[PDB]
Design a protein around this nucleic acid. Sequence first.
RNA 1: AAUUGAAGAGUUUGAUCAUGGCUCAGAUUGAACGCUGGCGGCAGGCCUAACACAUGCAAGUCGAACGGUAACAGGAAGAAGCUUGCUUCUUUGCUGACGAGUGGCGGACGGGUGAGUAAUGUCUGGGAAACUGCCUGAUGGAGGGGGAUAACUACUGGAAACGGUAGCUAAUACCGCAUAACGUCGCAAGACCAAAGAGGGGGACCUUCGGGCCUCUUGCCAUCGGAUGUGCCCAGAUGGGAUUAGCUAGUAGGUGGGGUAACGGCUCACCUAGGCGACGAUCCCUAGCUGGUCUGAGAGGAUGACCAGCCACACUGGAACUGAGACACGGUCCAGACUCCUACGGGAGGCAGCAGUGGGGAAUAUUGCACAAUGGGCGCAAGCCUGAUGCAGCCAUGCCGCGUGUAUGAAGAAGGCCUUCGGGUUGUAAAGUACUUUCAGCGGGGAGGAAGGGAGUAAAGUUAAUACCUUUGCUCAUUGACGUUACCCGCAGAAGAAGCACCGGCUAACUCCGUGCCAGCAGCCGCGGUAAUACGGAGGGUGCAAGCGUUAAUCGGAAUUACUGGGCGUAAAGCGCACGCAGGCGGUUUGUUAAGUCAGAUGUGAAAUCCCCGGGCUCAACCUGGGAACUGCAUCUGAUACUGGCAAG
Lengths: 371, 82, 205, 85
Amino acid sequence: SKEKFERTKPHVNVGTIGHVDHGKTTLTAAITTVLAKTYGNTSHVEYDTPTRHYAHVDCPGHADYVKNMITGAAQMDGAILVVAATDGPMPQTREHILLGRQVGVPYIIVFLNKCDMVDDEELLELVEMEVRELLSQYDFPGDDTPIVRGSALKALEGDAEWEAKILELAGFLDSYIPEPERAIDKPFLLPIEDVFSISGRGTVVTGRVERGIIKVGEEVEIVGIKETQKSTCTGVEMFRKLLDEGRAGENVGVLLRGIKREEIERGQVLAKPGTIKPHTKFESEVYILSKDEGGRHTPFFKGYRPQFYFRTTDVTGTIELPEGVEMVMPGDNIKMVVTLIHPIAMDDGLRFAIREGGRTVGAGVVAKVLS
Amino acid sequence: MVTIRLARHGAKKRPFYQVVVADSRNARNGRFIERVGFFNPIASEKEEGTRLDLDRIAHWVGQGATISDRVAALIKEVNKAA
Amino acid sequence: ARYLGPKLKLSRREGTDLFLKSGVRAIDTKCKIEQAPGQHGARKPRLSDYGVQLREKQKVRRIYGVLERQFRNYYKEAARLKGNTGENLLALLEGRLDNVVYRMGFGATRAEARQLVSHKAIMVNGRVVNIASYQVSPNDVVSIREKAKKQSRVKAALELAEQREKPTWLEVDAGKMEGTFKRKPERSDLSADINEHLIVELYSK
Amino acid sequence: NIKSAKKRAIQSEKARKHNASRRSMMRTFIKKVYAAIEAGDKAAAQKAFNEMQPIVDRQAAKGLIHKNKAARHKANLTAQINKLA
RNA sequence: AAUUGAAGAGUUUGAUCAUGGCUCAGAUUGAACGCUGGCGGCAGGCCUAACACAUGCAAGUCGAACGGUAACAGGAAGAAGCUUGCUUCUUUGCUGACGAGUGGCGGACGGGUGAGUAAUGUCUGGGAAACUGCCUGAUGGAGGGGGAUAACUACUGGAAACGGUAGCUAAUACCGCAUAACGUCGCAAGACCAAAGAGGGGGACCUUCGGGCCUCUUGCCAUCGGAUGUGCCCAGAUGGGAUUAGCUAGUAGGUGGGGUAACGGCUCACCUAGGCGACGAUCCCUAGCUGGUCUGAGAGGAUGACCAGCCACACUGGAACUGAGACACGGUCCAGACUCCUACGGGAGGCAGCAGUGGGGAAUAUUGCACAAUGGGCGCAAGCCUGAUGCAGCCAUGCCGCGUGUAUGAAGAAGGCCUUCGGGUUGUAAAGUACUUUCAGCGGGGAGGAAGGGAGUAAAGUUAAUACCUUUGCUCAUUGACGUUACCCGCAGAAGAAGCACCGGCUAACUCCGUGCCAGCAGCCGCGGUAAUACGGAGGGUGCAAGCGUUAAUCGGAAUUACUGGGCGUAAAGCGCACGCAGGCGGUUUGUUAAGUCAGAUGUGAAAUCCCCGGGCUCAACCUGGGAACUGCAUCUGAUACUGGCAAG
Ligand SMILES: C/C=C\C=C\[C@@H]1O[C@](O)([C@H](CC)C(=O)NC/C=C\C=C(/C)[C@@H](OC)[C@@H](C)[C@@H]2O[C@H](/C=C/C=C/C=C(\C)C(=O)c3c(O)cc[nH]c3=O)[C@H](O)[C@@H]2O)[C@H](O)[C@H](O)C1(C)C
Ligand SMILES: Nc1nc2c(ncn2[C@@H]2O[C@H](COP(=O)(O)OP(=O)(O)O)[C@@H](O)[C@H]2O)c(=O)[nH]1
Ligand SMILES: [Mg+2]
Ligand SMILES: [Mg+2]
Ligand SMILES: [Mg+2]
Ligand SMILES: [Mg+2]
Ligand SMILES: [Mg+2]
Ligand SMILES: [Mg+2]
Ligand SMILES: [Mg+2]
Ligand SMILES: [Mg+2]
Ligand SMILES: [Mg+2]
Ligand SMILES: [Mg+2]
């Protein structure tokens, strides 16, 4: 809160969701150190590339942390698959790539650690070919993707070769990730993802601005679980730096006045007044396929109670279908009505995720609202 | 020190000033000794609104009451002795 | 917050010559007006006490357009003053500017007079006022500004004014839309359709 | 802070030193006068009173304890000495 | 023309009366909650945790005190890349100014909180034993000196806080001398004890050719007084408890010393053994007090929201210094807790200031703008700053005002509901025709808060003087955050703005459907066991209205603590009886005292607030002028009927 941030080199979000205990934290720390040297839980570090300013999100690679990882990847603009070159693909890596494809991460860069732990020039190529084949078979891009090999912990050790290699890694990261599209057309909207309580400052809510801008001193409305209320913003900041306005697409922390830590939970949205209204039941078309798209095999019936993940959080919901469909067997391209317990401010065209038993069943697009 | 000054008592956007002999150790709205009169800023300049006691002012000046800028200005506005 | 809504039902709730709408469209006892005959028409439960006093207060308030709190303030002022509390209260009610306009004729109805006073169709002593609660003093003059002259609003009101009788204290010329208010009325000239000491008893309760 | 309290504190300390020295020397002079009085002498007591009077009156005029304080001790000392002298 | 003054109802019982409590009808608040919500004016906004605090700011000013120059506007001492007019370097410490530092003043005021405190507090009425910078009037003086010491230099301990070494070192800092009155001591005699001189014009007198000197602005040393803010003492009053009856020996007093700016056990040594207490001593609990506020016709009861006076406090506690003025609210030292920083050698901190955060709570504010006006402190003065203050934000928290429209129209349509099946009903309600456009909203014009002060000058005093300065006016510019000012004028259209509670009696308001002592309402009476005007819903009416209901607290009705204004045989209540002290009252007559009582007069009862007569904000809310009142208190003089002191019967 002592640095006046300059809105140059537009913000781009990059997230590392690589394999567990394969060097994600070490890799991001090494990247930050080498960039700050040559240029002068979800860990949100930042670094200013000469091309663009990036915010690096090291997400937890644990399966049980998938719920917050969903927002971390939806938050994310470019994925970094961090994997060891001595073990190759893993079930955890496959789950992570499936989640990334289901959340819609366009650009992914593969990094191969433990390059020097292997005294050969064929095993590294074999594992690179294997991961490339995995990407090409799991609906991912192919030979037009920069694949990065090298050591993630020696990048911090005194060297020159690996420093140059990681600098080249950062270069094509910023090359392969062009200027992203921002949605500052509609009024301001920001889904909440974390809450902090600053002693002497107050409560601050973190998140990626979905749309619109936030000027210092603007009135906004909290809409979400069990509550729709009003508030005032004072002191827009980003990564402990002074800001003047907050564009859309970057993870920022907005300071709210008259906010209670227990009263405000994750799942709500800070919108412009009179824009969106929370609803508990709405009509949506489902896009489940027969068997090979996450959906189950046996022809289940009504009363299904899945979690409907949204931009922020999820909630257990019920589904009702119009007459003409005796069963709700997988293969549901039809429209139905979904009722949720916790009301969340929603708009037409919203894309949500249907999940159950730790696996995604199908997608859904909001068609109408029944309040 | 003992001095004659003005104290504000009117409502918001409609001030009202009372001229009074008060020790400087007190506040504007604080205590005083003897009231001298009033000077209305708006003054509703058809009727009255300016009433000072020059005899009491002179008596207190003789004893050592330091005249203030506003009191002297009001005296010059109305008259030296009229 | 001036009262707004039905008026014939409001009048028939009590049943009196309170006053009527300025326009007339078959104002008579056609079939059911205030004492509806035929198969029903229970008009008065005949409440023992304090009920007629409440009804008198309500009819007084709805005639003059004043609210309960302001009416009670006027009653307190009248009790504080000398003379009779009821006549002092009636004097304040008539001194209310809207009733002055209505009794001068520029207001077709009392609600219309209040509307004009709010819309600045009235001036006092050569000064505009947009308060229907202003109290006029004796020996004064109240004029209508040039903008309100061209109102079919006012033309109809002045036409309807001369069908009634005229008061003891108002003298108005329509060649200039100006009226002189000379003295204050009394119970003798005021309509004897209500009792004042019952109202005095009620709020002294 | 750079407030005037620090300068006020050091000025108060210096004034404390000076006033303590002056008060201590005055007290020693008064103690010598009292010792001369109680010893039984009559001319040396008068001489000590006449020696202590100028310094105490000078300090009172400078204004460090009190003019009335100086007057009271002078009165007490003269009332003591004149009884036997 | 300045308290003209008072409501009851239900409930014991098969019914009556009385006693007796319970409940309700009214105001009112720092209110909270639920629903709803358009605007403006005024006021208010941690009652609980005197719980703990991030961060920013709230007390600096003065070069007309001083040695100085780190600045740098730098003309200028000098030089120039010499853009054909003024640009650049050590800047000569050199001017205006200014970093620190010495020095004077306020930082003891402005502001905030009731923790503590039952009288050391506060209000009222009295006094002497004392002080007082700044404000003043008078009387007098400002002479010559000496020595300190800061900055600064360099060495250098430390991350910082702060340091040692030698002087440079100046004064309005400090210290002797000239002195000693109107001052202090002392009966005098005598002794003692004082200053600081700074800024400016420069005629000229001399001329360190600035200067003394003609001089003005002053400031300073002492005394005598006023004003002022105080310190001290006394008398009355100011909560509960006797399931709180003795307390105290520095305690009561005296004799002397010391101490205090002054009295005094304030303290010391001695002596006397008292002092306080049944009118409540001592002890326990609680508590800021007052003007006032609420409720009352009144006496009374509750309380100290806003504001004003006073007191006390500043993490808890103790202590002292400076300073006239503190045991110090943004001075100092120390014990304890807590927190923070550290290089682990060692340091800092106390938001009951403005805001703001964590916790508590039924619950309460923005980390804004400005010295624009007043005031505050500093200074020749311009000028500095002020979280005092003024304005701005949010909240219907309370008061006031305005607006959602006005006539139409019988078609007594639509649709909802009821019906003795005719009809009624929400219901003139809507559409319409004429509009007005208040106030929202859009666009323009636009008063005032502004009195001052400053630059020139005309006249008067000062002096050879018109120098210099001051005072009475005239020309010149300015001096607003509020403030898209208030307001006014135009703009399309009613177009953009109503809810809450209740409807069996208390109390203003009636029908239907369904449940069927179930679900359920409620303050009471009391409902609800198939037909509920009482429950839930619906229709329709009533009471208030941007506000309606529940709850929280005080009084009233409660004459239900009753003095005005209760009762004790059977409703609660005569001690089981007698004696008797303190205490309360007291037969008849005279004289005398003026105590109680009555009369007259004085001062006073702060201001503020209630009230009366008026005035200005569009009337009001609100503000303000005058008057009365604040029934109190003390003093001076009379009255002697009554109670009482004294003397006689
Ligand atoms: C994953 C949960 C959270 C997502 C959040 C939301 O997802 C979304 O709502 C999203 C809507 C597109 C969503 O609902 N995703 C969440 C839910 C739905 C899942 C989406 C997308 C799919 O389509 C049906 C998606 C995989 C789809 O398959 C296509 C190809 C298939 C790939 C193979 C893997 C799959 C399945 C598979 O079963 C499979 C296999 O066949 C062989 C072997 N082994 C396998 O395991 C293509 O790759 C498309 O991408 C939006 O992306 C939102 O932006 C969001 C981020 C808020
Ligand atoms: N030998 C070797 N070890 C590596 C390399 N990259 C990462 N690691 C190891 O990965 C560990 C860090 O894992 P971490 O990032 O904390 O786990 P993650 O966050 O779940 O991915 C370190 O202890 C390294 O030893 C590499 O290139 N070579
Ligand atoms: Mg308080
Ligand atoms: Mg003594
Ligand atoms: Mg207390
Ligand atoms: Mg503080
Ligand atoms: Mg009573
Ligand atoms: Mg009573
Ligand atoms: Mg009784
Ligand atoms: Mg009995
Ligand atoms: Mg007996
Ligand atoms: Mg017995």
